[PDB]
Amino acid sequence: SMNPPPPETSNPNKPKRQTNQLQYLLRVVLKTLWKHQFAWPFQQPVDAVKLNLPDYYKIIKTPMDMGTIKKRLENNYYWNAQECIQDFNTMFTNCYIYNKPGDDIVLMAEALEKLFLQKINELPTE
Numbered sequence: 001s002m003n004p005p006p007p008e009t010s011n012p013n014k015p016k017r018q019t020n021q022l023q024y025l026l027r028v029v030l031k032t033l034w035k036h037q038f039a040w041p042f043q044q045p046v047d048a049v050k051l052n053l054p055d056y057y058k059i060i061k062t063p064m065d066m067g068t069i070k071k072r073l074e075n076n077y078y079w080n081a082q083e084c085i086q087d088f089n090t091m092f093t094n095c096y097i098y099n100k101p102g103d104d105i106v107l108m109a110e111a112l113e114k115l116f117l118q119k120i121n122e123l124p125t126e
């Protein structure tokens with residue numbers, strides 16, 4: 001029932017790049033998804049203690065949320081856009097794995113993912 005340490009958002013040894021694709025992921029993709037009415041359960045790591053979910057962190061081995069992605073974008077943690085796209089896809093896939101199809105949280109995740117996939121389609125050229 002305990003919460004694990006949050007995902008890594010700072011690593012001096014990890015190589016970084018500030019690219020136009022990563023800048024678009026912060027100013028366009030993250031910003032749009034963040035103000036959505038269904039963003040609030042995805043804005044911070046799942047608090048298994050507060051929500052009384054002792055099985056969450058036994059099912060989910062690669063936790064991810066938009067708060068962690070936001071910090072990784074602000075702190076220039078990524079090497080490329082594909083690394084950030086992988087964090088968003090992991091967050092959505094985590095929601096589908098833990099929860100049952102047709103749950104309210106799955107409907108919320110599916111609406112955010114539809115919006116994310118449309119913004120990712122308009123990813124500018126490197």
Ligand SMILES: Cc1nn(C2CC2)c2c1[C@@H](c1ccc(Cl)cc1)N(c1cc(C)c(=O)n(C)c1)C2=O
Nearest residue numbers: 040041042045046047051095098099104105108
């Ligand atoms: C209540 C409540 N309060 N919080 C915290 C943010 C204030 C959360 C919930 C639930 C929650 C939120 C919406 C629905 Cl429709 C159902 C359950 N939740 C989540 C989030 C994710 C990704 C998840 O997969 N599960 C299993 C729980 C939260 O983070």
